[PDB]
RNA sequence: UAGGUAGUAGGUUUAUUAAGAGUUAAACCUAGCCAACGAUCCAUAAUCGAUAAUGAAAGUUAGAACGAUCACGUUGACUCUGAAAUAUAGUCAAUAUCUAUAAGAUACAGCAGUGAGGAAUAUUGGACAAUGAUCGAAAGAUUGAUCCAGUUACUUAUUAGGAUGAUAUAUAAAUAUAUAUAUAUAAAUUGAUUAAAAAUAAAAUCCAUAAAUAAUUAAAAUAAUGAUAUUAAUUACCAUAUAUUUUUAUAUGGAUAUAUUUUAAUAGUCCUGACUAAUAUUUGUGCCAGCAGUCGCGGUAACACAAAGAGGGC
């Protein structure tokens, strides 16, 4: 139907993509700074102003964001076997191989996701600065006086 | 297959022309219900090779599209592949011989072509 | 497809994509489409009647309406402004039926590999057509720019060649040919001088359109152009044919026939195993329809063709071959845009 | 594949058809005690010989087992409880406890 | 103009026009009623279908047979 | 106002008079016999000026308007012959001036009512070999051969492809006498292409007309401000038209600039093949959110626009 | 439907819960809260989409099919277990039926099927081969999920034959190549007497393919397993070698009597006064019979009724 136009004429839907990292990481410095920034007040403010009692039984401030330390996430989720146990049994060997592959996969997933997130912030920052510079250049060309401008009547003094 | 999160084929297409989505799904949901994620596609019918190609030595190819990175993540968090999906992942080189069974264990069968990773 | 009924009716006078004799007369006597005095609906209906008769008549109206594309494709010459000559208007609306030209059956007709679109469909359906080396047996297969398609040579010769006469039909032509040959040997022998004098005068009005004069010069070198009584004496009378005696026995018949032009074979049956008139000659009335398409490159020696592009409209020309003028196509386009409303 | 060799427990096809069970001893005339026929005939040939769907698939499964040195002992198909299937067990048991023990 | 009062299976009583030349409709005859009014008869807003139920097709109808429940002559 | 109109010839013809009751003839049938002329014992129409093909590279297309329906001529002298009161054919009383000086354009126009349809020029067997030998042996680019002989690049590429097929056919003696006879006959029916003749040369500056540009935008600028093709291209947010022409000339397989390598960046895996396996698995890397069959997509099977395609074997398959 | 609300609106405290709250229960306070931009009440309805229909579009319609969500499993309430259930469970009651007559069992909105209702919607089918689900260490078992087939023009698509084709005889000396072949005689269906046609329509001629027949035979699935299935497709004596985009071609080993299986083509339905495509006319009826979406038609030359001819759509 007409609705498909809004989505590239794609008919049907896919399940929403899950996020490997469910919270921001401790290396996403940009986000960490924003939450630490003082909250605004006034017309466009957020929070209870000084001297304004908050509702009894309610928390005055918002809960602190939980930043994930990928090193700690990896240490608690896919910890390595503490001892090199004797896997002489056929089933023990299969389990050891499967556990090793699973640990390799999930550690690569968490570290690739963190890298992607950090690399995406840098790319956006670079792209925005470029766009800003290009806009200034474009605007400067627009403001540049051409010879044709002499034929445009003007009343600058008035 | 066990667990609550399984990697299995969901059937699409028409009668007598099956195609499949490779999906991560809750064990209890319907086979063709919208899954957690769609990892790829499996077309079971091999591409037909012409008479000349056959003598030339061309082997029919079954085509699978798969997100290799996302699939590894789901194996990492304990998702359990179905038997057919297991065969596909072992052929792709994502899973290894630790996932083979006694009935399909090709312990002694000659390799005519070795898994080759290329760019195209 | 739509059943073929009364396609070549002279009263209706519809023009079809064929080389048929009756279809040539309908085209000859048409004298354009009359659109005067008709209301807008009547004009559109008439345009639809005429155009659809030629462009894809075998397609059902409902299928055609689905196939019909409102978007027409033209080209922009980027040097026009750098020429200085009076520019011509592009006939955009002659692209109304261009969507059909990419069909395999239409492509065969435009390549002159079949005598009509209907025959092209049967060639495709019977397994005689290949596209890019693969046998395609669906007339509705759509070609893409660069595709090469081929037709079995025997089928193309049967479409562009004369009809094979039957043994009985060709055996009555030889009987008459022998009678009219023995009359030329009785007039050459009774008064040889006049016949040779007439013979020389005929060769003056040949105009070079008749290659027989070129061959005749060879014959005059095989024997100043002065009369020779040895000629009349050399002439011999062929023996009459008893149709009943040699009836049902072709080898016998093709051993009792020996004419100066047709030797040891019945008329049109030099090789009865071939599916066409032998020796091969073009079908009657081929010149009026022999049009070389701008969108196909044809190799008649091998019966191969390449689909260069989809037909396009350019200043002063449309690559869509049509017997109808732009005003008729404009009315037809107006009809299908609104689904005949 | 290849033709396995007769053993002491399964000397001939008739012994093979008796060990697997599932009434497969009623096909002894189809095979004619020919060892090679049992290990060469595929489903298409067995279907042409009148073997029904269930039996021919079962034989081919046991032929593969024999070829791989896996046991060919009869495994029985499932059967409903004496007191009936779960959906009709409450009713059956109620009518069986009022006609046996009152 | 031949008409008929009919009690529909939903309890509504209507007046239906009987089309065609000649009809065998009587009281208690099972009829099928479709939409369509008889312009010159006020209050007759429906038509009975010829060749359905107990109403037979028009006898000896040659043209437009499908509209009068007449089967094709061999 | 509209009524059924029997398609009588627009030109004058001899209508039927009083008829014997058993003839049961029609005025359309008698008009056709007059167009065709007498039919000989061999089933031919020798008196009709269209029965036989031209052999001088000049198409013989119907000209009913210019000859006023007179289609009969002497089979050897090509001199007009018309029907007389006696029922015989003889010289016309007055020569037809409309048939002696025909415009060059009309000669190539097959249909009287459509002057926008013209026949194409046939390429001589020599020019084709020259083009074949320059692209393949000398190594010239299709752009060069196109700009040299005045042929569009797609046609140049097609000639190379077809000449290759004629060499294989001639190398295996597959071109029979009948095929040679037919080819020559058809060659002598069409006007031969002349690379030198400027009018015969094909335009080489044509580009497809986009749709966004098809609209008419107007800008009011200063009276002495220069505005050119490049400025217009920026306004319409399209590459310059000259650039489009240049990019369309580098598409030929033998043309300069032909390049295709930016796509060789998709990881592919070819699964191990073991003895006895009848097929090989090929895995192509994809991205979640793009790959897969979508859920709840529109079913078109019961709709007029149901998608129909063709597989590698040419078999019709539903998509 | 104009007033509604009385745990109603708010405050405080306890109980209960993993958890907020008149959410529930208890207590004590304040007099609030909603409402003509529609409260309360009544009626009706499962909701929606990157689904379907339509339109230039904004929109409108549907909610069958595909997918998402909710609710329910004859009706009501309650309880147990549990992370989660007022569970298709259990308890009690209601309605109906049944047999074993018990503080009994059953409730087809699971599949197939039957009666009823209705204008109207199908098999009491096959298989677990595939994809899944459950149990099992495994071997395996189960699966009306599912996959297949059956019924039904309900919808869509492909195919459902091309080229040639206005007559038949008799006719004509006794090979530098002819050639506008020419005469007689008979025959010629419906309409019509010329712009009145039916009609290239038919037959006939040429050449095909489908099916059949024969051989062969993928793929769905492999370690093995194929319900569909008398598989699709291909090939036309079969096999082989060489050359040979394809394809073609030659030659070979075996195979029949120099050739090699056979061979087609019966569409319906509506309409022709105008809107609205339909000019070749004619017969019956006579404001009757009937037709009709709108205007209207029919009272003896009816283009409109009922038909023949011819014609126009799909
Ligand atoms: K359309
Ligand atoms: K209200
Ligand atoms: K339903
Ligand atoms: K199963
Ligand atoms: K009709
Ligand atoms: Mg288990
Ligand atoms: Mg009527
Ligand atoms: Mg009209
Ligand atoms: Mg509280
Ligand atoms: Mg309350
Ligand atoms: Mg209280
Ligand atoms: Mg309801
Ligand atoms: Mg809605
Ligand atoms: Mg639904
Ligand atoms: Mg709604
Ligand atoms: Mg349903
Ligand atoms: Mg419930
Ligand atoms: Mg309930
Ligand atoms: Mg309950
Ligand atoms: Mg019920
Ligand atoms: Mg049911
Ligand atoms: Mg009923
Ligand atoms: Mg069953
Ligand atoms: Mg008569
Ligand atoms: Mg067949
Ligand atoms: Mg098999
Ligand atoms: Mg009358
Ligand atoms: Mg009318
Ligand atoms: Mg009438
Ligand atoms: Mg009639």
mmCIF file of N, CA and C (backbone and C1' of nucleotides) in Angstrom, chain B residues 1 6 8-9 11 15-16 18 20 27-29 31 33-34 42 44-46 51-52 62 82 84-85 87 103-104 106 109, chain G residues 66-69 130-135 138-140 145-149 219-223 228 242-247:
data_model
loop_
_atom_site.group_PDB
_atom_site.id
_atom_site.type_symbol
_atom_site.label_atom_id
_atom_site.label_comp_id
_atom_site.label_asym_id
_atom_site.label_seq_id
_atom_site.Cartn_x
_atom_site.Cartn_y
_atom_site.Cartn_z
ATOM 1 N N UNK B 1 16.838 -30.071 19.655
ATOM 2 C CA UNK B 1 17.389 -28.770 20.129
ATOM 3 C C UNK B 1 16.725 -28.372 21.447
ATOM 4 N N UNK B 6 16.600 -20.390 20.027
ATOM 5 C CA UNK B 6 17.047 -21.373 19.052
ATOM 6 C C UNK B 6 17.228 -20.725 17.689
ATOM 7 N N UNK B 8 16.929 -21.552 13.848
ATOM 8 C CA UNK B 8 16.188 -22.544 13.083
ATOM 9 C C UNK B 8 15.667 -21.891 11.811
ATOM 10 N N UNK B 9 15.175 -22.724 10.900
ATOM 11 C CA UNK B 9 14.638 -22.256 9.629
ATOM 12 C C UNK B 9 13.140 -21.995 9.735
ATOM 13 N N UNK B 11 9.889 -21.216 7.234
ATOM 14 C CA UNK B 11 9.579 -21.491 5.837
ATOM 15 C C UNK B 11 8.815 -20.339 5.195
ATOM 16 N N UNK B 15 3.908 -23.315 -2.211
ATOM 17 C CA UNK B 15 3.836 -24.770 -2.251
ATOM 18 C C UNK B 15 4.734 -25.314 -3.351
ATOM 19 N N UNK B 16 5.574 -26.280 -2.991
ATOM 20 C CA UNK B 16 6.496 -26.991 -3.871
ATOM 21 C C UNK B 16 7.721 -26.149 -4.213
ATOM 22 N N UNK B 18 9.874 -24.278 -1.643
ATOM 23 C CA UNK B 18 10.217 -23.763 -0.310
ATOM 24 C C UNK B 18 11.468 -22.894 -0.322
ATOM 25 N N UNK B 20 13.612 -20.428 2.870
ATOM 26 C CA UNK B 20 13.687 -20.374 4.322
ATOM 27 C C UNK B 20 14.391 -19.112 4.793
ATOM 28 N N UNK B 27 11.637 -20.688 21.457
ATOM 29 C CA UNK B 27 11.249 -22.071 21.195
ATOM 30 C C UNK B 27 9.736 -22.235 21.084
ATOM 31 N N UNK B 28 8.973 -21.499 21.891
ATOM 32 C CA UNK B 28 7.535 -21.719 21.985
ATOM 33 C C UNK B 28 6.731 -21.024 20.893
ATOM 34 N N UNK B 29 7.324 -20.110 20.133
ATOM 35 C CA UNK B 29 6.569 -19.392 19.118
ATOM 36 C C UNK B 29 6.431 -20.228 17.848
ATOM 37 N N UNK B 31 6.462 -21.585 14.046
ATOM 38 C CA UNK B 31 7.585 -21.681 13.119
ATOM 39 C C UNK B 31 7.711 -20.435 12.248
ATOM 40 N N UNK B 33 6.152 -17.434 12.885
ATOM 41 C CA UNK B 33 5.926 -16.192 13.608
ATOM 42 C C UNK B 33 7.141 -15.276 13.491
ATOM 43 N N UNK B 34 6.888 -13.974 13.538
ATOM 44 C CA UNK B 34 7.958 -12.990 13.512
ATOM 45 C C UNK B 34 8.985 -13.304 14.605
ATOM 46 N N UNK B 42 17.986 -19.190 3.253
ATOM 47 C CA UNK B 42 18.444 -20.461 2.708
ATOM 48 C C UNK B 42 17.525 -20.865 1.568
ATOM 49 N N UNK B 44 16.931 -23.980 -0.655
ATOM 50 C CA UNK B 44 17.386 -25.379 -0.679
ATOM 51 C C UNK B 44 17.603 -25.959 -2.068
ATOM 52 N N UNK B 45 17.039 -25.374 -3.120
ATOM 53 C CA UNK B 45 17.089 -25.955 -4.458
ATOM 54 C C UNK B 45 18.405 -25.537 -5.110
ATOM 55 N N UNK B 46 19.280 -26.475 -5.478
ATOM 56 C CA UNK B 46 20.547 -26.091 -6.114
ATOM 57 C C UNK B 46 20.333 -25.448 -7.475
ATOM 58 N N UNK B 51 24.584 -28.770 -19.459
ATOM 59 C CA UNK B 51 25.288 -29.968 -19.905
ATOM 60 C C UNK B 51 26.782 -29.707 -20.049
ATOM 61 N N UNK B 52 27.140 -28.624 -20.738
ATOM 62 C CA UNK B 52 28.548 -28.290 -20.921
ATOM 63 C C UNK B 52 29.223 -28.031 -19.580
ATOM 64 N N UNK B 62 24.222 -24.248 -3.794
ATOM 65 C CA UNK B 62 23.120 -23.781 -2.965
ATOM 66 C C UNK B 62 23.544 -22.469 -2.320
ATOM 67 N N UNK B 82 19.258 -25.542 15.337
ATOM 68 C CA UNK B 82 18.641 -26.784 14.896
ATOM 69 C C UNK B 82 19.643 -27.617 14.099
ATOM 70 N N UNK B 84 19.510 -28.822 11.022
ATOM 71 C CA UNK B 84 19.773 -28.313 9.680
ATOM 72 C C UNK B 84 20.611 -27.043 9.730
ATOM 73 N N UNK B 85 20.301 -26.138 10.658
ATOM 74 C CA UNK B 85 21.098 -24.924 10.793
ATOM 75 C C UNK B 85 22.515 -25.268 11.231
ATOM 76 N N UNK B 87 24.242 -27.927 10.373
ATOM 77 C CA UNK B 87 24.962 -28.324 9.169
ATOM 78 C C UNK B 87 25.387 -27.105 8.360
ATOM 79 N N UNK B 103 25.856 -39.781 13.551
ATOM 80 C CA UNK B 103 25.236 -40.211 12.303
ATOM 81 C C UNK B 103 25.795 -39.473 11.094
ATOM 82 N N UNK B 104 26.167 -38.204 11.251
ATOM 83 C CA UNK B 104 26.670 -37.399 10.145
ATOM 84 C C UNK B 104 28.179 -37.202 10.192
ATOM 85 N N UNK B 106 31.539 -37.231 9.232
ATOM 86 C CA UNK B 106 32.296 -37.599 8.035
ATOM 87 C C UNK B 106 33.769 -37.813 8.365
ATOM 88 N N UNK B 109 35.889 -39.346 4.714
ATOM 89 C CA UNK B 109 35.373 -39.056 3.385
ATOM 90 C C UNK B 109 36.294 -38.029 2.746
ATOM 91 P P C G 66 -3.308 -16.560 6.063
ATOM 92 O "O5'" C G 66 -2.109 -15.524 5.923
ATOM 93 C "C5'" C G 66 -1.053 -15.741 5.000
ATOM 94 C "C4'" C G 66 -0.009 -14.660 5.102
ATOM 95 C "C3'" C G 66 0.375 -14.246 6.513
ATOM 96 O "O3'" C G 66 1.312 -15.122 7.114
ATOM 97 C "C1'" C G 66 -0.029 -12.317 5.213
ATOM 98 P P G G 67 1.181 -15.496 8.670
ATOM 99 O "O5'" G G 67 1.605 -14.161 9.425
ATOM 100 C "C5'" G G 67 2.927 -13.660 9.314
ATOM 101 C "C4'" G G 67 3.046 -12.243 9.820
ATOM 102 C "C3'" G G 67 2.590 -11.985 11.244
ATOM 103 O "O3'" G G 67 3.527 -12.405 12.218
ATOM 104 C "C1'" G G 67 1.784 -10.272 9.831
ATOM 105 P P A G 68 3.043 -12.751 13.711
ATOM 106 O "O5'" A G 68 2.724 -11.330 14.351
ATOM 107 C "C5'" A G 68 3.753 -10.374 14.550
ATOM 108 C "C4'" A G 68 3.219 -9.097 15.149
ATOM 109 C "C3'" A G 68 2.338 -9.250 16.375
ATOM 110 O "O3'" A G 68 3.070 -9.469 17.568
ATOM 111 C "C1'" A G 68 1.327 -7.741 14.871
ATOM 112 P P U G 69 2.479 -10.428 18.710
ATOM 113 O "O5'" U G 69 1.322 -9.563 19.376
ATOM 114 C "C5'" U G 69 1.610 -8.304 19.959
ATOM 115 C "C4'" U G 69 0.355 -7.551 20.318
ATOM 116 C "C3'" U G 69 -0.679 -8.309 21.134
ATOM 117 O "O3'" U G 69 -0.353 -8.410 22.508
ATOM 118 C "C1'" U G 69 -1.756 -7.165 19.381
ATOM 119 P P A G 130 13.137 -35.843 6.636
ATOM 120 O "O5'" A G 130 12.801 -34.414 6.028
ATOM 121 C "C5'" A G 130 13.496 -33.921 4.893
ATOM 122 C "C4'" A G 130 12.999 -32.555 4.502
ATOM 123 C "C3'" A G 130 12.960 -31.531 5.622
ATOM 124 O "O3'" A G 130 14.218 -30.912 5.830
ATOM 125 C "C1'" A G 130 10.901 -31.506 4.457
ATOM 126 P P U G 131 14.735 -30.597 7.315
ATOM 127 O "O5'" U G 131 13.833 -29.374 7.780
ATOM 128 C "C5'" U G 131 13.790 -28.169 7.033
ATOM 129 C "C4'" U G 131 12.828 -27.187 7.648
ATOM 130 C "C3'" U G 131 12.869 -27.101 9.164
ATOM 131 O "O3'" U G 131 13.909 -26.262 9.633
ATOM 132 C "C1'" U G 131 10.624 -27.294 8.441
ATOM 133 P P G G 132 14.450 -26.403 11.136
ATOM 134 O "O5'" G G 132 13.237 -25.880 12.016
ATOM 135 C "C5'" G G 132 12.929 -26.471 13.266
ATOM 136 C "C4'" G G 132 11.512 -26.164 13.670
ATOM 137 C "C3'" G G 132 11.091 -26.666 15.039
ATOM 138 O "O3'" G G 132 11.519 -25.816 16.084
ATOM 139 C "C1'" G G 132 9.433 -27.221 13.456
ATOM 140 P P A G 133 12.145 -26.439 17.420
ATOM 141 O "O5'" A G 133 10.882 -27.002 18.204
ATOM 142 C "C5'" A G 133 9.771 -26.167 18.491
ATOM 143 C "C4'" A G 133 8.632 -26.957 19.082
ATOM 144 C "C3'" A G 133 9.021 -28.006 20.110
ATOM 145 O "O3'" A G 133 9.252 -27.460 21.395
ATOM 146 C "C1'" A G 133 7.523 -28.955 18.559
ATOM 147 P P U G 134 10.333 -28.128 22.376
ATOM 148 O "O5'" U G 134 9.584 -29.407 22.955
ATOM 149 C "C5'" U G 134 8.342 -29.283 23.627
ATOM 150 C "C4'" U G 134 7.750 -30.634 23.936
ATOM 151 C "C3'" U G 134 8.692 -31.642 24.571
ATOM 152 O "O3'" U G 134 8.859 -31.439 25.963
ATOM 153 C "C1'" U G 134 7.493 -32.678 22.818
ATOM 154 P P C G 135 10.261 -31.774 26.672
ATOM 155 O "O5'" C G 135 10.299 -33.362 26.723
ATOM 156 C "C5'" C G 135 9.302 -34.089 27.422
ATOM 157 C "C4'" C G 135 9.439 -35.573 27.201
ATOM 158 C "C3'" C G 135 10.836 -36.153 27.340
ATOM 159 O "O3'" C G 135 11.234 -36.346 28.685
ATOM 160 C "C1'" C G 135 9.818 -37.011 25.393
ATOM 161 P P A G 138 19.609 -37.920 23.758
ATOM 162 O "O5'" A G 138 20.007 -39.194 22.890
ATOM 163 C "C5'" A G 138 21.293 -39.308 22.300
ATOM 164 C "C4'" A G 138 21.605 -40.737 21.931
ATOM 165 C "C3'" A G 138 20.669 -41.384 20.921
ATOM 166 O "O3'" A G 138 21.009 -41.070 19.582
ATOM 167 C "C1'" A G 138 20.957 -42.832 22.767
ATOM 168 P P A G 139 19.881 -41.032 18.441
ATOM 169 O "O5'" A G 139 19.476 -42.559 18.247
ATOM 170 C "C5'" A G 139 20.429 -43.521 17.823
ATOM 171 C "C4'" A G 139 19.908 -44.925 17.993
ATOM 172 C "C3'" A G 139 18.579 -45.220 17.316
ATOM 173 O "O3'" A G 139 18.718 -45.523 15.939
ATOM 174 C "C1'" A G 139 18.517 -46.002 19.546
ATOM 175 P P G G 140 17.672 -44.931 14.874
ATOM 176 O "O5'" G G 140 16.292 -45.605 15.293
ATOM 177 C "C5'" G G 140 15.080 -44.870 15.297
ATOM 178 C "C4'" G G 140 14.330 -45.069 16.586
ATOM 179 C "C3'" G G 140 12.916 -44.518 16.626
ATOM 180 O "O3'" G G 140 11.972 -45.376 16.012
ATOM 181 C "C1'" G G 140 14.066 -43.851 18.573
ATOM 182 P P A G 145 -4.169 -29.222 13.208
ATOM 183 O "O5'" A G 145 -2.683 -28.874 13.659
ATOM 184 C "C5'" A G 145 -1.744 -28.362 12.728
ATOM 185 C "C4'" A G 145 -0.578 -27.703 13.419
ATOM 186 C "C3'" A G 145 0.396 -26.976 12.507
ATOM 187 O "O3'" A G 145 -0.034 -25.668 12.174
ATOM 188 C "C1'" A G 145 1.599 -28.361 13.998
ATOM 189 P P U G 146 -0.409 -25.303 10.658
ATOM 190 O "O5'" U G 146 0.785 -25.919 9.804
ATOM 191 C "C5'" U G 146 2.116 -25.457 9.973
ATOM 192 C "C4'" U G 146 3.122 -26.457 9.465
ATOM 193 C "C3'" U G 146 3.002 -26.841 7.999
ATOM 194 O "O3'" U G 146 3.600 -25.891 7.136
ATOM 195 C "C1'" U G 146 3.271 -28.792 9.314
ATOM 196 P P C G 147 2.943 -25.550 5.711
ATOM 197 O "O5'" C G 147 3.476 -26.705 4.758
ATOM 198 C "C5'" C G 147 4.857 -27.022 4.701
ATOM 199 C "C4'" C G 147 5.077 -28.430 4.216
ATOM 200 C "C3'" C G 147 4.410 -28.778 2.899
ATOM 201 O "O3'" C G 147 5.178 -28.351 1.789
ATOM 202 C "C1'" C G 147 4.014 -30.500 4.485
ATOM 203 P P C G 148 4.466 -27.950 0.409
ATOM 204 O "O5'" C G 148 4.100 -29.355 -0.236
ATOM 205 C "C5'" C G 148 2.840 -29.570 -0.837
ATOM 206 C "C4'" C G 148 2.523 -31.036 -0.933
ATOM 207 C "C3'" C G 148 1.231 -31.374 -1.653
ATOM 208 O "O3'" C G 148 1.366 -31.366 -3.061
ATOM 209 C "C1'" C G 148 1.303 -32.544 0.383
ATOM 210 P P A G 149 0.378 -30.474 -3.958
ATOM 211 O "O5'" A G 149 -0.883 -31.418 -4.191
ATOM 212 C "C5'" A G 149 -0.752 -32.654 -4.874
ATOM 213 C "C4'" A G 149 -1.739 -33.679 -4.376
ATOM 214 C "C3'" A G 149 -3.208 -33.370 -4.611
ATOM 215 O "O3'" A G 149 -3.630 -33.648 -5.935
ATOM 216 C "C1'" A G 149 -2.913 -34.101 -2.391
ATOM 217 P P A G 219 19.742 -34.711 -8.013
ATOM 218 O "O5'" A G 219 18.833 -33.541 -7.435
ATOM 219 C "C5'" A G 219 19.068 -32.187 -7.789
ATOM 220 C "C4'" A G 219 17.931 -31.299 -7.353
ATOM 221 C "C3'" A G 219 17.375 -31.565 -5.964
ATOM 222 O "O3'" A G 219 18.154 -30.990 -4.931
ATOM 223 C "C1'" A G 219 15.591 -31.377 -7.491
ATOM 224 P P A G 220 18.226 -31.690 -3.489
ATOM 225 O "O5'" A G 220 16.837 -31.313 -2.812
ATOM 226 C "C5'" A G 220 16.479 -29.957 -2.604
ATOM 227 C "C4'" A G 220 15.009 -29.804 -2.312
ATOM 228 C "C3'" A G 220 14.469 -30.582 -1.124
ATOM 229 O "O3'" A G 220 14.760 -29.971 0.121
ATOM 230 C "C1'" A G 220 12.997 -30.813 -2.959
ATOM 231 P P A G 221 14.822 -30.851 1.462
ATOM 232 O "O5'" A G 221 16.180 -31.669 1.330
ATOM 233 C "C5'" A G 221 17.340 -31.321 2.083
ATOM 234 C "C4'" A G 221 18.442 -32.331 1.882
ATOM 235 C "C3'" A G 221 18.818 -32.587 0.425
ATOM 236 O "O3'" A G 221 20.188 -32.975 0.336
ATOM 237 C "C1'" A G 221 17.944 -34.566 1.364
ATOM 238 P P U G 222 21.359 -31.918 0.625
ATOM 239 O "O5'" U G 222 22.075 -32.493 1.924
ATOM 240 C "C5'" U G 222 22.782 -33.722 1.886
ATOM 241 C "C4'" U G 222 22.214 -34.724 2.859
ATOM 242 C "C3'" U G 222 23.122 -35.888 3.213
ATOM 243 O "O3'" U G 222 24.074 -35.557 4.209
ATOM 244 C "C1'" U G 222 20.965 -36.703 2.692
ATOM 245 P P A G 223 25.568 -36.137 4.118
ATOM 246 O "O5'" A G 223 25.393 -37.679 4.467
ATOM 247 C "C5'" A G 223 26.444 -38.607 4.259
ATOM 248 C "C4'" A G 223 26.097 -39.949 4.844
ATOM 249 C "C3'" A G 223 24.754 -40.517 4.415
ATOM 250 O "O3'" A G 223 24.825 -41.197 3.174
ATOM 251 C "C1'" A G 223 24.958 -40.652 6.768
ATOM 252 P P U G 228 2.086 -40.387 -2.572
ATOM 253 O "O5'" U G 228 2.041 -38.951 -3.256
ATOM 254 C "C5'" U G 228 1.060 -37.993 -2.889
ATOM 255 C "C4'" U G 228 1.540 -36.592 -3.166
ATOM 256 C "C3'" U G 228 1.968 -36.309 -4.597
ATOM 257 O "O3'" U G 228 0.866 -36.005 -5.437
ATOM 258 C "C1'" U G 228 3.602 -35.477 -3.088
ATOM 259 P P U G 242 36.698 -37.355 -26.787
ATOM 260 O "O5'" U G 242 36.871 -36.605 -28.181
ATOM 261 C "C5'" U G 242 38.001 -36.856 -29.003
ATOM 262 C "C4'" U G 242 37.782 -36.384 -30.418
ATOM 263 C "C3'" U G 242 37.434 -34.915 -30.593
ATOM 264 O "O3'" U G 242 38.561 -34.059 -30.520
ATOM 265 C "C1'" U G 242 35.962 -36.220 -31.891
ATOM 266 P P A G 243 38.522 -32.753 -29.582
ATOM 267 O "O5'" A G 243 37.711 -31.682 -30.438
ATOM 268 C "C5'" A G 243 38.343 -30.973 -31.494
ATOM 269 C "C4'" A G 243 37.404 -30.728 -32.650
ATOM 270 C "C3'" A G 243 36.444 -29.558 -32.508
ATOM 271 O "O3'" A G 243 37.047 -28.308 -32.797
ATOM 272 C "C1'" A G 243 35.281 -31.450 -33.327
ATOM 273 P P U G 244 36.543 -26.975 -32.055
ATOM 274 O "O5'" U G 244 34.954 -27.065 -32.128
ATOM 275 C "C5'" U G 244 34.258 -26.776 -33.331
ATOM 276 C "C4'" U G 244 32.768 -26.929 -33.158
ATOM 277 C "C3'" U G 244 32.151 -26.156 -32.002
ATOM 278 O "O3'" U G 244 31.903 -24.797 -32.314
ATOM 279 C "C1'" U G 244 31.365 -28.384 -31.967
ATOM 280 P P U G 245 29.216 -21.305 -31.929
ATOM 281 O "O5'" U G 245 29.158 -20.777 -30.426
ATOM 282 C "C5'" U G 245 30.345 -20.522 -29.689
ATOM 283 C "C4'" U G 245 30.087 -20.523 -28.201
ATOM 284 C "C3'" U G 245 29.136 -21.594 -27.691
ATOM 285 O "O3'" U G 245 29.746 -22.865 -27.548
ATOM 286 C "C1'" U G 245 28.546 -19.514 -26.749
ATOM 287 P P U G 246 29.196 -24.116 -28.395
ATOM 288 O "O5'" U G 246 27.645 -24.174 -28.036
ATOM 289 C "C5'" U G 246 27.217 -24.341 -26.693
ATOM 290 C "C4'" U G 246 25.928 -23.602 -26.418
ATOM 291 C "C3'" U G 246 24.649 -24.268 -26.904
ATOM 292 O "O3'" U G 246 24.199 -25.296 -26.032
ATOM 293 C "C1'" U G 246 24.631 -21.978 -27.507
ATOM 294 P P U G 247 22.642 -25.696 -25.935
ATOM 295 O "O5'" U G 247 22.034 -25.337 -27.363
ATOM 296 C "C5'" U G 247 21.981 -26.299 -28.406
ATOM 297 C "C4'" U G 247 22.268 -25.665 -29.742
ATOM 298 C "C3'" U G 247 22.520 -26.630 -30.892
ATOM 299 O "O3'" U G 247 21.325 -27.045 -31.531
ATOM 300 C "C1'" U G 247 24.275 -25.054 -30.793
#
